[PDB]
Design a protein around this nucleic acid. Structure first.
Ligand SMILES: [Cu+2]
Lengths: 130, 235, 50
DNA sequence: GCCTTGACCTTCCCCTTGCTGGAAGGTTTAACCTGTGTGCAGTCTGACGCGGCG
DNA sequence: CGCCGCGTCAGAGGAGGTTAAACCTTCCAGCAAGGGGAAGGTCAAGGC
């Protein structure tokens, strides 16, 4: 196809698309005699998957595995759901440690007077002084 | 078809002959213009050949005028930026009764002052060495410049006397140490060598070598030998 | 420079301002200063001239 | 003064994510359109050469 | 043939003006947030 048309359909740009391509994460679209990256429908929907996978959170490598499954007709939906729930687990732990963060942040905040003073307890307790 | 339509070429060209380059080379470029225009002409569009050909010609000459016409190759996009910019500033000095300020026409041109300023730093042409700075033919400009690159004789004598002083100081110290320093620092040879190279040429030592050149400084700091080189502290 | 008249002279002679000949005969001076040992080297000699 | 001996600093280069921005460089548009010049330069001028022309 | 005509050569800094865009391609710089490792020195401390 033409390239901008495909990237405005899918929202990407030729630069990001070419990054993904150099990562070997989709079908390589052929060129033309002139050199335009010859896209297709296969490239279109492979790109759509490679886009939405990192949105889900499957990384470059893992989204590439989703793609090579998208090429594979044998693909194990079983595996796919293991990958799914594994990433669910990482996102859970991410949430939990961020909750620990915000908890300690608010513990430090609410103790601070916020009375435009230089004697901020947060500052001095973040350093191992006194 | 070529011979049919040459007067078209001179017409276009002498519209474009605003005094950038010269007539004939522009005209010849119009001729290659016309050649490739005819080379791929659909005739069942019904239109007249003239216009199709014409804009291909325009592209040929407006490209070549860009590629050439300067000692300094400025690629095309800078050129068209300049052209755009000047078209703008004409309007700005209609309306303000004044030349414009970079900030003003830049923010109208939707880009920050740095690029504008650099474009302006870059734009002007060279200045013809043989121009007569003399009001009459008493002087050309090529007379009143200097070779600020070459040498200076006093400096050559300076370096030579410094070198004499240096190896005079060397010969006062031990042979091995002075020689090891010559290769360490490349005196009286082509090259330079370092801790491990010079060492393992001599022998393996590393840290006591450092301390050896240190005590060399100690024997050299020595306020009897500096004074032949105290002058070169200014050096 | 400009000329003027020396009437008390002997015609095998000429007038001369100092600083002209001073800068003209400069490296001569540098050399024999090194020779006498006042200025050890060239930079010092040049400073003493200045 | 010869060997280290171990442990420590500093600097440079390279390497991992997920792209983004910018430079430098290329190829096609269908209403049309056909012969400069464009401001010079004010003519110095006497001998000596040389080319056509008698 | 001897003009008549033409040609070549002699003798204080400082610049100025306009005439495309829309689609493509490669490749280098750059971020947060550092981490690894070369390669040379450099702090103490030895053994003759
Ligand atoms: Cu506080």
């Amino acid at each position: 196809m033409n390239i901008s048309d495909v990237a405005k359909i899918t929202g990407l740009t030729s630069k990001a698309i070419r990054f993904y391509e150099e990562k070997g994460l989709v079908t390589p679209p052929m060129r033309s005699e002139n050199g335009y990256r010859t896209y297709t429908q296969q490239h279109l929907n492979e790109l759509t998957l490679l886009r939405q996978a990192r949105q889900v959170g499957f990384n470059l490598e893992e989204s590439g595995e989703l793609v090579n499954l998208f090429n594979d007709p044998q693909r194990h939906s079983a595996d796919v759901k293991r990958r799914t729930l594994e990433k669910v687990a990482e996102i859970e732990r991410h949430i939990e440690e961020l909750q620990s963060m915000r908890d300690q942040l608010l513990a430090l905040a609410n103790a601070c007077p916020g009375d435009d003073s230089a004697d901020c307890p947060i500052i001095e307790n973040l350093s191992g002084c006194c | 078809m070529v011979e049919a339509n040459l007067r078209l070429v001179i017409s276009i060209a002498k519209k474009y002959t605003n005094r950038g380059l010269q007539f004939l080379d522009l005209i010849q470029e119009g001729n290659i213009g016309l050649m490739k225009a005819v080379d791929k002409f659909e005739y069942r569009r019904g239109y007249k050949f003239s216009t199709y050909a014409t804009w291909w010609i325009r592209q040929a000459i407006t490209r070549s005028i860009a590629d050439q016409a300067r000692t300094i190759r400025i690629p095309v996009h800078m050129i068209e930026t300049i052209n755009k910019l000047n078209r703008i500033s004409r309007q700005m000095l209609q309306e303000m009764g004044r030349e414009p300020t970079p900030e003003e026409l830049a923010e109208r041109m939707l880009m920050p002052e740095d690029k504008i300023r650099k474009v302006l730093k870059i734009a002007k042409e060279p200045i013809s060495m043989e121009t007569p700075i003399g009001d009459d033919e008493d002087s050309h400009l090529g007379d009143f410049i200097e070779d600020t690159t070459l040498e200076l004789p006093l400096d050559s004598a300076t370096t030579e006397s410094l070198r004499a002083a240096t190896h005079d100081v060397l010969a006062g110290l031990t042979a091995r140490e002075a020689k090891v320093l010559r290769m360490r620092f490349g005196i009286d040879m082509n090259t330079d060598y370092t801790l491990e190279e010079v060492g393992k040429q001599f022998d393996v030592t590393r840290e006591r070598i450092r301390q050896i050149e240190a005590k060399a400084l100690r024997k050299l700091r020595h306020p009897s030998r500096s004074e032949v080189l105290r002058s070169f502290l200014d050096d | 420079s400009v000329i003027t008249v020396g009437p008390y002279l002997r015609l095998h002679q000429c007038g001369l301002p100092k600083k002209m000949a001073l800068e003209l005969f400069k490296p001569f001076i540098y050399g024999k200063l090194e020779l006498r040992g006042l200025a050890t080297t060239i930079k010092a000699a040049k400073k003493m001239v200045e």
